[PDB]
Design an enzyme around this catalytic site. Structure first.
Site, PDB file in Angstrom:
ATOM      1  N   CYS B 105       0.833  -1.198   0.000  1.00  0.00           N
ATOM      2  CA  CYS B 105       0.000   0.000   0.000  1.00  0.00           C
ATOM      3  C   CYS B 105       0.871   1.254   0.000  1.00  0.00           C
ATOM      4  CB  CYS B 105      -0.948   0.012   1.203  1.00  0.00           C
ATOM      5  SG  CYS B 105      -2.103   1.475   1.296  1.00  0.00           S
ATOM      6  N   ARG B 108       0.076   4.740   2.861  1.00  0.00           N
ATOM      7  CA  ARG B 108       0.151   4.522   4.301  1.00  0.00           C
ATOM      8  C   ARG B 108       0.582   5.756   5.080  1.00  0.00           C
ATOM      9  NH1 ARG B 108       3.874  -0.631   4.802  1.00  0.00           N
ATOM     10  NH2 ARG B 108       4.469  -0.101   2.652  1.00  0.00           N
ATOM     11  N   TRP B 277      -9.195   6.297  -0.914  1.00  0.00           N
ATOM     12  CA  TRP B 277      -9.479   6.976  -2.167  1.00  0.00           C
ATOM     13  C   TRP B 277      -8.477   6.479  -3.197  1.00  0.00           C
ATOM     14  CZ3 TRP B 277      -8.454   9.982   2.278  1.00  0.00           C
ATOM     15  CH2 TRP B 277      -7.130  10.416   2.412  1.00  0.00           C
ATOM     16  N   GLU B 282      -4.336   3.725 -10.826  1.00  0.00           N
ATOM     17  CA  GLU B 282      -5.146   2.520 -10.672  1.00  0.00           C
ATOM     18  C   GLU B 282      -6.281   2.502 -11.682  1.00  0.00           C
ATOM     19  OE1 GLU B 282      -5.920   1.074  -6.479  1.00  0.00           O
ATOM     20  OE2 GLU B 282      -5.618   3.213  -6.070  1.00  0.00           O
TER      21      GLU B 282
END
Ligand code: HEM
Ligand code: HEM
Ligand SMILES: Cc1cc(N)nc2cc(-c3ccc(OCC4CC4)c(CN)c3)ccc12
Ligand SMILES: Cc1cc(N)nc2cc(-c3ccc(OCC4CC4)c(CN)c3)ccc12
Ligand SMILES: C[C@H](O)[C@H](O)[C@H]1CNc2nc(N)[nH]c(=O)c2N1
Ligand SMILES: C[C@H](O)[C@H](O)[C@H]1CNc2nc(N)[nH]c(=O)c2N1
Ligand SMILES: [Cl-]
Ligand SMILES: [Cl-]
Ligand SMILES: [Gd]
Ligand SMILES: [Gd]
Ligand SMILES: [Gd]
Ligand SMILES: [Zn+2]
EC number: 1.14.13.39
Lengths: 401, 401
Positions: B105, B108, B277, B282
């Site tokens: 991720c 973070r 969000w 992506e």
């Protein structure tokens, strides 16, 4: 045996070749260090035996009289002299296998087409220079580049190593300055200072080709200038941004790495420069746009009239794409071999398929194989890969200073 | 203690936090599997004790008081019932920790700002839907997105599990033809056919929001139509390419992953959907341009009049960049929170620096942190990273069929 999935297509394979991994990498079950840039007669004999088995497999002579004859002879030579000598055909096979085995090389579809120059009789730094000049001339071939390696005498007890101190045969000087900034290529500040320290008269441009520092056994390095007409260069222009040519950017035709160690059957060749041809992203993205290299990205984006005050305009991405276009256009205009990252990664996918059939797998370093722009637009992004070390191999080695 | 270098700046750190890794990863000294997407009781008290210690460390309350007391009650609770219940504050701390520990991720930096909805007293697929609806409305917040997770009851022996059958709360349908090939999202062909095989009358379009298949323990799933008013979506337009809107592309506001298993102190929550969000790549690079997703890249290039006949025009790179521009522009115009890959990676580098001083390192998966376009233009490309498993954690789990 690790299962390997391709996520674009759905393919599934098993890398059985990794079980033969000769040496150990940096990862453990606790922690993966895959992203790190830098990861005795009985054991010489064990390595030599494995390489001889590889060679006689390749010529369909496994278990034959000639095979056991060679094994016995290598045993006897290591017992008599502490080392042994490769036959010419074994050297050619071993150099190709080292390329074939290189996990970070995306150009390996070409591995069988490699010109091997045998310089193991080289005697001096002066002869070394002559061998290197002919390597550059052959490989450059007026822009129609040809893959080649020149291999200088192996490491041996009682004598120092042959070494090329330069990281590549062609490199641009990096001149430290005050105000602290580097003029030229910041990657080459240290080798530039060593050349000056060894009597080179430095220039002061951004694209000054460095001299060679060549070390013969047990001798200080010796400085050699490359004839300018041996070093083919490409001035950079953009097909539609006419101001781009006024940046005065250039790059050289021949990528020739000269600081790695070739290992074949336990023998070590600390001087064995090898060259291919460029993938355009090495020049356009890394060499020209890395913040710690020529770092031209913002200057190009400003000239393109992009909005550089906010990241969401994607000015960095747009400028980097046009720099890569300029590189491809300029090399094609100059009739100098170059491969874009789409063609290169597509050909690497074919290599993986070839190697799965030939050997049951292929050592590959995902983070180096995936190009530095447009990663997921290339098929290698969607291919799981297995990284491991096979021998014969090209290895990193410490700098000789 | 692995040494970790940033190659842009030259700075060095040591990852001492790696020494605490629990679950073994897939790599071994002989082969790295870092690029693989999926890596291949009194044990409960050991994991609970460790997690309780983590909790009281984080509030400076190790070494007596409620620390000692909380240790005995989990002991007695497991001794009596065989499992244990987390306090609400522990559930909160554990949810933030699993997010903080997620190696793949890049968002973070936000790990301390997480809204935790405690749904552990749920007990029907009807209650689930109300919880999921509360979450979606809270997290969406009219486009001002807020990180959130909803935690359904912990798995216990003897009874079935709460599970959401969709991979995310918002997904688009994917439909076949005489030719298998898909109208809609090919990623969701499987769940689309499950939904239809449970009552849902299929739509006709390329962006039909799928229904939810919600599974209370020991019962077949139940379909639930999401209120259209509750699914915020963004039609895609380009700031200067007037025809881009005419392509009819859209994407949804809320990325809410609903198929992962939350593990805290030895307890397992197979139903714990979390949301944040989007990072723009992506949507623009992976969801819209992957060859096995909407695969729109050539259609956009035709509209831009690009030369798709040769790879070296870099038409793929150019079209991809404009799709990403359109995503960012559209979401900003709709006032829906989004972050571009330059801003996100810059924030992750700040996160790495924060975590170095707070915990001595940070588990990070280089191949997932580096964005799928313009990798080396972001700072994370030049940062070496160490990947390992810490608990609390989000884990992958098999599909519930
Ligand atoms: C023929 C065209 C070739 C192309 C297009 C090509 C491409 C590349 C690229 C893009 C890299 C990554 C370097 C970086 O990102 O800075 C690389 C690495 C490498 N290449 Fe190739 N290459 C070619 C030929 C060769 C040849 C002829 C050899 C040796 C005989 C070779 C051996 C290597 C090695 C040893 C590495 C990295 C070392 C490692 O695996 O740790 N390459 N290549
Ligand atoms: C707040 C803004 C956030 C952003 C911008 C963000 C961004 C991302 C991205 C880009 C990925 C890569 C996945 C892919 O490319 O397919 C990812 C993975 C992931 N995220 Fe985040 N995320 C955010 C919030 C969160 C939250 C709130 C949670 C949980 C509470 C979370 C947990 C995860 C997990 C578990 C993964 C997969 C990582 C793994 O398997 O180690 N993220 N995120
Ligand atoms: C034959 C050849 C062709 C080509 N087209 N490219 C090549 C790139 C490298 C190479 C190898 C290692 C390396 O980095 C090592 C780390 C600095 C110590 C870099 C620079 N990234 C380039 C080596 C050979 C190449
Ligand atoms: C909270 C959040 C925000 C965001 N902005 N993004 C996120 C992306 C993922 C995620 C995790 C794994 C994963 O991959 C699993 C493999 C397909 C089975 C994918 C899809 N690549 C997305 C998970 C959570 C995300
Ligand atoms: C830290 C990171 O491993 C480093 O920047 C790597 C990533 N991948 C790379 N890939 C290639 N081809 N060349 C490189 O120099 C690098 N550098
Ligand atoms: C094969 C490879 O591991 C796979 O394509 C990974 C690479 N990196 C990724 N990185 C992110 N953020 N998301 C992904 O889905 C992937 N896919
Ligand atoms: Cl280079
Ligand atoms: Cl998504
Ligand atoms: Gd022009
Ligand atoms: Gd200028
Ligand atoms: Gd037109
Ligand atoms: Zn690894």
């Amino acid at each position: 045996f690790p299962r390997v999935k391709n996520w674009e297509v759905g393919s599934i394979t098993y890398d059985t070749l990794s079980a033969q991994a000769q040496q150990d990498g940096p990862c453990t079950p606790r922690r993966c260090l895959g992203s790190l840039v830098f990861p005795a007669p009985e054991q010489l004999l064990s390595q030599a035996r494995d390489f001889i088995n590889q060679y006689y497999s390749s010529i369909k002579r496994s278990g034959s009289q000639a095979h056991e004859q060679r094994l016995q002879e290598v045993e006897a030579e290591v017992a008599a002299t502490g080392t042994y000598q490769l036959r010419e055909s074994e050297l050619v096979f071993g150099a190709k296998q080292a390329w074939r085995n290189a996990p970070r090389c995306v150009g390996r579809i070409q591995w069988g087409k490699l010109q091997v120059f045998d310089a193991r009789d080289c005697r001096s730094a002066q002869e070394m220079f002559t061998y290197i000049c002919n390597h550059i001339k052959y490989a450059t071939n007026r822009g129609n580049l040809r893959s080649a390696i020149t291999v200088f005498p192996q490491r041996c007890p009682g004598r120092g190593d042959f070494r090329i101190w330069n990281s590549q045969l062609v490199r641009y000087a990096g001149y430290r300055q005050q105000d602290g900034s580097v003029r030229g290529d910041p990657a080459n500040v240290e080798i530039t200072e060593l050349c000056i320290q060894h009597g080179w008269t430095p220039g002061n441009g951004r694209f000054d080709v460095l001299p060679l520092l060549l070390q013969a056994p047990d001798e200080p390095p010796e400085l050699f200038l490359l004839p300018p007409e041996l070093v083919l260069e490409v001035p950079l222009e953009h097909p539609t941004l006419e101001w781009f040519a006024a940046l005065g950017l250039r790059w050289y035709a021949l990528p020739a790495v000269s600081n790695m160690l070739l290992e074949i059957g336990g023998l070590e060749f600390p001087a064995a420069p090898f060259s291919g041809w460029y993938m355009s992203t090495e020049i356009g993205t890394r060499n020209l746009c890395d913040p710690h290299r020529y770092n031209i990205l913002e200057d190009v984006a400003v000239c393109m009239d992009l909005d550089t005050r906010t990241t969401s305009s994607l000015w960095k991405d747009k400028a980097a794409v046009e720099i890569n276009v300029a590189v491809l256009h300029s090399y094609q205009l100059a009739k100098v071999t170059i491969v874009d990252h789409h063609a290169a990664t597509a050909s690497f996918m074919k290599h993986l398929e070839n190697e799965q059939k030939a050997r049951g797998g292929c050592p590959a370093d995902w983070a180096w194989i995936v190009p530095p722009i447009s990663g997921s637009l290339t098929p290698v992004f969607h291919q799981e890969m297995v990284n491991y070390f096979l021998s014969p191999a090209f290895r990193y080695q410490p700098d000789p200073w």
